[PDB]
Amino acid sequence: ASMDKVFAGYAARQAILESTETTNPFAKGIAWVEGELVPLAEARIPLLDQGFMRSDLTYDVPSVWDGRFFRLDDHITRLEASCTKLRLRLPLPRDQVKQILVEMVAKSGIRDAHVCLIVTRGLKGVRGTRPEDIVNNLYMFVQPYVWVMEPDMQRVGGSAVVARTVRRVPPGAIDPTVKNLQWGDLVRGMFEAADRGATYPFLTDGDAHLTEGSGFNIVLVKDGVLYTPDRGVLQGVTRKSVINAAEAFGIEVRVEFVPVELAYRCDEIFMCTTAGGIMPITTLDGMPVNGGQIGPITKKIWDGYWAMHYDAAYSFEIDYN
Amino acid sequence: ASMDKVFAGYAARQAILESTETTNPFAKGIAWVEGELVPLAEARIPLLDQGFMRSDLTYDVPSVWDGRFFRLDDHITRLEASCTKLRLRLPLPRDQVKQILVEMVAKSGIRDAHVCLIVTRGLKGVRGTRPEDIVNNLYMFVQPYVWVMEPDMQRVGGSAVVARTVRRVPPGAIDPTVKNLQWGDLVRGMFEAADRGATYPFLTDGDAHLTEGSGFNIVLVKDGVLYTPDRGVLQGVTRKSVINAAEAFGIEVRVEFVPVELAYRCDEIFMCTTAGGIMPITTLDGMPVNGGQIGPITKKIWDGYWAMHYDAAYSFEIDYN
Ligand SMILES: Cc1ncc(COP(=O)(O)O)c(C=O)c1O
Ligand SMILES: Cc1ncc(COP(=O)(O)O)c(C=O)c1O
C-alpha cells in the first residue's frame, strides 16, 4: 500500500511550493507565447487564432512527479502523430521543444506538474493560401498537478454513471485518437453525472459498447483479467503504463470491444489518466461494485504505476539549479 | 435579376471602406474585450479561458448590409436559446448588447459586415467551484463581410461533393442546433473536398441522409418543391429567410429527412448562410447538376432574399453619425 507514502510526499512538496509564491512569480505556473515566458494567469492569445475560432488544434500533456518527467518522449511522439493526422507540423524541432519544457519547469520550481503543448492551425484558414505558406502556432505551459480524482477520493473510490443523455462523438466524425479540446459531449456527460448525483460519466459508442470518460480511459476487471475499449478512445499513456505493469505482474489485458453489460457484472472498475493516475470506481448507477470496496488488482496496478515514476526506463530527473 | 445591382453596390461601398484603411484604425474590424474597444487584429483573450481550453462556448453571427442590420433580434434570440441549452447566461442585458453592437458598427464605418458574439463558460470549469463563483465571458467583434462563395462564383455556381471520409457529428453527441466552434468534422470535410478537386462538402448523418456543410445549410429543388434537412443541422436564419421568400412566391418547402439519393436526381441545388447569402451549386461529385446552369427557382430565391434586406419587417438602418 503506497498511497500513504505517495500522498504524504506530494503534500510536503506542495507546502514548499506555496512558501515560494510571494517571491517566485512563476510558482503558480508559467507559459510560453511567441517565444516569451510569462506567468500563466497573464498569458493571452490572439482572438482570431483558428485554435479558438474553429478549435482547429491538437494538444498533449506529459507530467512531472517528484521532479521527474514521466514518459516525455511517448507524449511528444503522440503529439507529432496527432499533428500528422490534422496536416499540422510541430513549429519547433523536437529536441528544442524538450529543452524549453525542462527550462520552464526549472524556472517555476514546481515538482509535481502538468505540462501542456498546443499546436493550432494559426491565424488563417488553409483555403485562402497554399498549405506550405500557412503558419501553425505553438503554445506551452507548466501548471501545478491537476487531479481528475483528488487524493482523498482515491482512498475511498468514486461514483460513476453510464451516460444516457449523451454518447461519445464517433471516429468517422472526429478521430478520438487525435487528442483534442472539442469537449461538447464530454461536458454534457459531466453535467449528466452531477444531475444524477454521481461524479464521473462513462460514455457509450451509441451502439451498446463502452468508450471513454470526460478526460480518462475506462478499465474493467473480471475473473483476474483486465478489459478496456480499443476503438473510439484516446490511446492513453496511463493505459499503456497499466499494460506494462500488468504484463510484468502476469495479468492478462484485453484491448477490444467492451459491451456495456460487462460493467454491471465485473469485479472491479478503475479510470486512468495523466491528471490523477489510477482512480478506483466503487459505485456504478448507484449500485456498489462487487461489494463497494477497492479491489486487489486495482491496488496492485496503483502501486505499480507510481513505482514506474522512479524507473529510469520511464522517467528522468530534472535539474532545478 | 438583382445580382448586378447588389454586387455593384457592394463593390462601391467596399472601395470607399478600403480607401480609409490608413486613416481609420477600425476599418479592418473592431473588437470588445472586457469592456474595451480595440482594433480586431490586436484583440487578445486569456489562454486559460474555457472557450479555448474546452471550446466550452456558443456563438452567433448577425450581419449588416448597406448600413442595415438584418434580422438582429432573431440572431440574439438564437444565441440566448443556445446559452440556455449549454447552461450559460449572456453576461449583459440584451438591450445593452444591441446598443454596444450598433456603437461598434458606427465606430468601424463598415457598411457590410459580420458581427460575431461569443459566450464562454469562463476562466474556471463548474466542478469544484460555486455556481455563483462561475462567471461566463462575452467577446464581440465587427469584421468586413465574409464570402463563403465570392460574388463572381455566385454568377456561375460552385462545385460540391457528398463527403465519404467523414460524416456529421450526431445530435446525441453534440447538439447542432447549438451554434458552436467544434469544427473537427467540418474541417475534415473541407480538406476532403479540396483533395477531390471541389470546394464544398455536404456531410451525411452516417445513415444515408443529408445534414449540412462547413458553414451553410443545404437546399435541393425537385419538380418545383424545395427540400431541406430538419434533424442534425443548425436552424439557419438564412434558411428561415428562404422559407419566407418561398411562401410569398407560392413555392412549397419541405423541412424533413432528405435521402442522399435526391441530391443526384434533383433539378437545382443551392447552399445558404449569413456569410454569402444564396450560393448555387452547379457541379456535384464532378457531374453537372441538371445541365450545369443556375436554375430558375434559385434565381427567384436569390432576388427575394436580397429584397428582404430593405424591408422594415426584417431590417433597420444604422446611424453612422
Ligand atoms: C478524452 C481522454 N481520454 C483519455 C485520456 C487519458 O490519456 P492519458 O493517459 O494519455 O493522459 C485523456 C487525458 O486527458 C482524455 O482527455
Ligand atoms: C454549421 C452551420 N450550419 C448552417 C449555417 C447557416 O446559418 P445562418 O443562415 O443562421 O448563418 C452556419 C452559419 O454559420 C453554420 O456554421
Residue numbers in the entry:
A (entry chain A), B (entry chain B): 2 to 322
Sentences from the study reporting this entry:
Herein, we report a simple, high-throughput, low-equipment dependent, and generally applicable growth selection system for engineering amine-forming or converting enzymes and apply it to improve biocatalysts belonging to three different enzyme classes.
Only the AtTA(YHC) with D5Y/F115H/E117C mutations gave some colonies for all four groups. A total of 96 colonies were sequenced and led to 15 different variants, which were evaluated to yield two significantly more active variants (additional H55R and V147F/V149Y, 1.7–1.9 U/mg). We further combined the beneficial mutants and removed the accidentally introduced D5Y mutation from the first round of evolution. The resulting variants were evaluated and AtTA(RHC) with H55R/F115H/E117C gave the highest activity of 4.2 U/mg (110-fold over the wild type) while maintaining very high enantioselectivity. The PLP part binds to AtTA(RHC) in a very similar position to PLP in the AtTA(wt), and the (R)-1 part fits into the active site of AtTA(RHC) very well. According to the docking results, particularly the F115H mutation precisely carves out additional space in the substrate-binding pocket to accommodate the piperidine ring of (R)-1. E117C expands the pocket and may facilitate the binding of the tert-butyl group of (R)-1. Furthermore, the H55R variation offers a positively charged side chain which provides a hydrogen bond (2.9 Å) between the guanidinium group and the carbonyl group of (R)-1. Therefore, only three precise mutations have been sufficient to significantly (>100-fold) improve the activity of AtTA towards (R)-1, enabling practical asymmetric synthesis of this key chiral amine intermediate of several drugs. The best AtTA variants were applied for the asymmetric synthesis of (R)-1: AtTA(RHC) produced (R)-1 (98% ee) in quantitative conversion in 5 h, while AtTA(wt) only gave (R)-1 with 8.7% conversion under the same conditions.
